[PDB]
A paper describes a structure:
Here we have used an [name] variant, named [name]-1C, with AU1 and Myc peptides inserted into loops L1 and L2, respectively, as a model to understand the effect of inserted peptides on scaffold structure, stability and oligomerisation properties.
X-ray crystallography confirmed that monomeric [name]-1C exhibits typical cystatin fold but only in very specific conditions, when crystallised in the presence of 19% dioxane. Interpretable electron density was observed for polypeptide regions R4-L48 and A93-N113 whilst residues D49-F75 were visible but less well ordered, indicating higher flexibility of this region. The [name]-1C monomer exhibits a cystatin-like architecture with five anti-parallel β-sheets and a perpendicular α-helix, showing that peptide insertions into loop regions do not affect the [name] scaffold backbone. However, despite these shortcomings, the backbone fold and lattice interactions can be confidently discerned and have been extensively validated. However, in solution and in the absence of dioxane, monomeric [name]-1C exists in dynamic equilibrium with domain-swapped dimeric and dominant tetrameric species. Melting temperature of [name]-1C was 54 °C ± 1 °C, as measured by changes in intrinsic fluorescence, compared to 79.9 °C reported for [name] alone, which indicated that the inserted peptides significantly destabilized the scaffold.
Numbering used by the authors: 4 to 77, 93 to 113
Amino acid sequence: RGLSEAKPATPEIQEIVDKVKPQLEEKTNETYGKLEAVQYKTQVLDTYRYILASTNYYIKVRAGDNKYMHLKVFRVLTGYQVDKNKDDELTGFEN
């Protein structure tokens, strides 16, 4: 269950964070206007050869000025860490 290398984020990662934002807000009881999705890492759990599914995303989202969060999305939000800084490496954590 090794983690991928830190890759720059893409529009699909941005849409992933946009679609899991309601779950994040329901879990934190706080509304977020924009999550910029700075970077992301991937974690393969089972086998899907080319690419379709069976993966965990660890996305560093920028919520605001000096306000970053780390999201763990399976697309169901399985985890999150609040109050992270820009240079914090994305690491795996229990859900």
